[PDB]
Amino acid sequence: AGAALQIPFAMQMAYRFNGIGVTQNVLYENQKLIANQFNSAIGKIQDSL
Amino acid sequence: KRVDFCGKGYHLMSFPQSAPHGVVFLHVTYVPAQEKNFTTAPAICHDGKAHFPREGVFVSNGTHWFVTQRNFYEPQIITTDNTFVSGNCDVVIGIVNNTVYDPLQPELD
């Protein structure tokens, strides 16, 4: 939408949780589990491929 | 709100014009400009409680902390009407110490 403006990635993930109706404390208080789940999900794609 | 469906930027409004066998759309959009960098933090710890912005981000100009809206820089001081509380400050990665100002009790002298 213009020039790239940097933001830390967990803070971008919190904006995106807001965009679906969940408060952002739910992301910050679960950060490690959410990242573990994303990593297992990405590791399952290359296994199926 | 569909990205790039009505031009580049944040769609404000669009005007139609007729062409021969066709149509022309003049899209008016909003494009952000002249950014500055800041230090930032996800929450703020005060009295053993974690505070999150209601809307906006916590930013630091070098020595002081403010809340701003995310798309236009307009800094304000962090109060209990700017933020909400959830939990204690032991669980959030990158939490920062600052004071969150209450209006009522300095009204009550």
Ligand SMILES: *[C@@H]1O[C@H](CO)[C@@H](O[C@@H]2O[C@H](CO)[C@@H](O)[C@H](O)[C@H]2NC(C)=O)[C@H](O)[C@H]1NC(C)=O
């Ligand atoms: C929410 O669901 C997750 C499942 O992804 C739970 O986390 C797992 O809990 C089991 C316990 O049976 C552990 O063995 C796993 O190692 C956990 N997974 C990860 C990625 O940490 C989590 O406990 C659930 N939360 C609640 C409150 O029920």
Ligand SMILES: *[C@@H]1O[C@H](CO)[C@@H](O[C@@H]2O[C@H](CO)[C@@H](O)[C@H](O)[C@H]2NC(C)=O)[C@H](O)[C@H]1NC(C)=O
């Ligand atoms: C960050 O902004 C603050 C403004 O709040 C500057 O601090 C001073 O703060 C006092 C009381 O809050 C004001 O009376 C002053 O007018 C403010 N400015 C000055 C120049 O004294 C602070 O200087 C700013 N810091 C940086 C690094 O820009």
Ligand SMILES: *[C@@H]1O[C@H](CO)[C@@H](O[C@@H]2O[C@H](CO)[C@@H](O)[C@H](O)[C@H]2NC(C)=O)[C@H](O)[C@H]1NC(C)=O
């Ligand atoms: C951002 O990354 C920096 C590393 O570049 C982290 O700084 C380190 O913090 C640890 C404490 O967890 C210290 O032991 C290291 O000495 C620091 N390294 C440097 C180079 O400063 C910083 O903590 C990270 N920020 C967050 C919020 O995790």
Ligand SMILES: *[C@@H]1O[C@H](CO)[C@@H](O[C@@H]2O[C@H](CO)[C@@H](O)[C@H](O)[C@H]2NC(C)=O)[C@H](O)[C@H]1NC(C)=O
């Ligand atoms: C932010 O403020 C809290 C509140 O005091 C600090 O917590 C103290 O941390 C030190 C060192 O980690 C401990 O020795 C104290 O026992 C803690 N106090 C309490 C009341 O728990 C915290 O360290 C501060 N954060 C930073 C980065 O300085």
Ligand SMILES: *[C@@H]1O[C@H](CO)[C@@H](O)[C@H](O)[C@H]1NC(C)=O
């Ligand atoms: C912000 O700082 C970075 C270096 O950390 C620099 O590359 C960038 O151009 C700066 N942008 C602005 C708007 O100051």
